[PDB]
């Protein structure tokens, strides 16, 4: 299987630097070329250039030039520089030929100058019925994301994430899982916070 | 640097039924080659984007032929012979013909499915939290269509209009419904003032709207 792999989020400060990375798997590196995209909110995704590593020679689309260099070896990189609100974005790698097309995962790039917080959590229990909708509240975090799985993960049917919002300069989401009624309290559910960027792993019992 | 332009942006549709969308480009796309190099993706949400049809017709490898691409030149049509509700997700054409490759600006595919009224949810602060000198009340309002919904906050009969965040999830994979989690923040203080706490929904599968309270003497 054809795997490329890249990092997640980075958080950098404005007119700073910043170097992201590219393992190619699954196939002869040397063979085709390698791709990067940006993606920002607004869905919209933008070309930046592609190098081939066979010789290291490289083609970059203008509006980039002056922005990102290119490197290889298997690994890829791409390295921004003096960056800036608008070069918070999402950049992918990815081989782009024709039936060959495989992509990154993308890394999240976010410039800010703001301090790097954890998520405090909250657990939602009702203060009746077939169904019981539990949840928890992940408040004041940066930057984003934030990964909630409940039991582990192994309660994915009837979950629900809902986006994070900006809340006072700091990110807010909750997460819902419904489950038969018969089941809580008697068995108890657990949600996951995961935020990697303050290397974090919370847990949350849900309680009566 | 080669426009591509999509429409619609935005397409609602009923499981079932056909969906075709458009693509037109700046400039011709054939290659001085003869190929012509205009491709579909799909990018499901959180998702990186997947490639459907490359070269204007070709499948990728597993993509089944409910999926065709056809066009010529300038203009292209990428069709959905029955939708399923997986399709939903936003589809981009992009070209490679011309240096820089550009993409298109995306068309989201909205499945159209039956009313469905919202199962609303109200939660008190936690302890944990009121601990901290904070009060969250929260609110959800889930597994419902259209996403057209309207949420009140209510404390003691008074409506509360600042300090309530809203979020909508995107439409559901599973059943094409929407979900959505109102929270009203108040301090730890202005919480233990008050008695009852409503959150009120305005939604069109409903006359009255949908009412979930707590009053504190749980
Ligand atoms: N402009 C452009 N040329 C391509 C692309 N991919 C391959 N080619 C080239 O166009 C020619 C034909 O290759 P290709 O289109 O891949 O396959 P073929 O048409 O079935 O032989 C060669 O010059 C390839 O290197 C692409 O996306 N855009
Ligand atoms: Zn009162």
């Known amino acids: 299987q054809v795997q490329l792999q890249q990092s997640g989020a980075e958080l950098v400060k404005p007119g700073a630097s910043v170097k992201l990375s590219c393992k190619a798997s699954?196939?002869?590196?040397?063979?085709?070329?390698m791709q990067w995209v940006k993606q920002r909110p607004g869905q919209g995704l933008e070309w930046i250039g592609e190098?081939?590593?066979?010789?290291?020679?490289?083609n970059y689309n203008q509006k980039f030039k002056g922005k990102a260099t290119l490197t290889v070896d298997s690994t890829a990189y791409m390295q921004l520089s003096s960056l800036t609100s608008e070069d918070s974005a999402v950049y992918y790698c990815?081989?782009?030929?024709?039936?060959?097309?495989?992509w990154g995962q993308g890394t999240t790039l976010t410039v800010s100058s703001a301090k790097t917080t954890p998520p405090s959590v909250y657990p939602l229990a009702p203060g009746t019925g077939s169904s019981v909708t539990l949840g928890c509240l992940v408040k004041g975090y940066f930057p984003e994301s934030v990964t909630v799985t409940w039991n582990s993960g192994s309660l994915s049917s009837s979950v629900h994430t809902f986006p994070a919002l900006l809340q006072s300069g700091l990110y807010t989401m909750s997460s819902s899982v419904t489950v038969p009624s018969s089941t809580w309290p008697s068995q108890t559910v657990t949600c996951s916070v995961a935020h990697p960027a303050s290397s974090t792993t919370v847990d949350k019992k849900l309680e009566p | 640097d080669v426009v591509m332009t999509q429409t619609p942006l935005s397409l609602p549709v009923s499981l079932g039924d056909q969906a075709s969308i458009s693509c037109r480009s700046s400039?011709?796309?054939?290659?001085?080659?003869?190929?012509?190099?205009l491709h579909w993706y799909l990018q499901k949400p959180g998702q990186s984007p997947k490639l459907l049809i490359y070269?204007?017709?070709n499948r990728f490898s597993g993509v089944p032929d409910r999926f065709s691409g056809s066009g010529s030149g300038t203009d292209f049509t990428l069709k959905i012979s029955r939708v399923e509700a997986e399709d939903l997700g936003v589809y981009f054409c992009?070209?490679?013909?011309?240096?820089?490759?550009?993409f298109g600006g995306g068309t989201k595919l909205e499945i159209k499915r039956a009313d469905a009224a919202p199962t609303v949810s109200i939660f008190p602060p936690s302890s944990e939290q009121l601990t901290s000198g904070g009060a969250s009340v929260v609110c959800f309002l889930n597994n419902f269509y259209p996403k057209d919904i309207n949420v009140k906050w209510k404390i003691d009969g008074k409506e509360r209009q600042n300090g309530v965040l809203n979020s909508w999830t995107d439409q559901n994979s599973k059943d094409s419904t929407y979900s959505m989690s109102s929270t009203l923040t108040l301090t730890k203080d202005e919480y233990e003032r008050h008695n009852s706490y409503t959150c009120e929904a305005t939604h069109k599968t409903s006359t009255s709207p949908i009412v979930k309270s707590f009053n504190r003497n749980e």
């Open positions: 990815a081989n782009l030929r024709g039936y060959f097309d495989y």
């Open positions: 070269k204007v017709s």
């Open positions: 699954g196939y002869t590196f040397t063979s085709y070329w």
């Open positions: 992009s070209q490679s013909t011309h240096v820089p490759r550009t």
């Open positions: 400039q011709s796309l054939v290659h001085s080659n003869g190929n012509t190099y």
């Open positions: 190098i081939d590593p066979s010789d290291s020679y490289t």
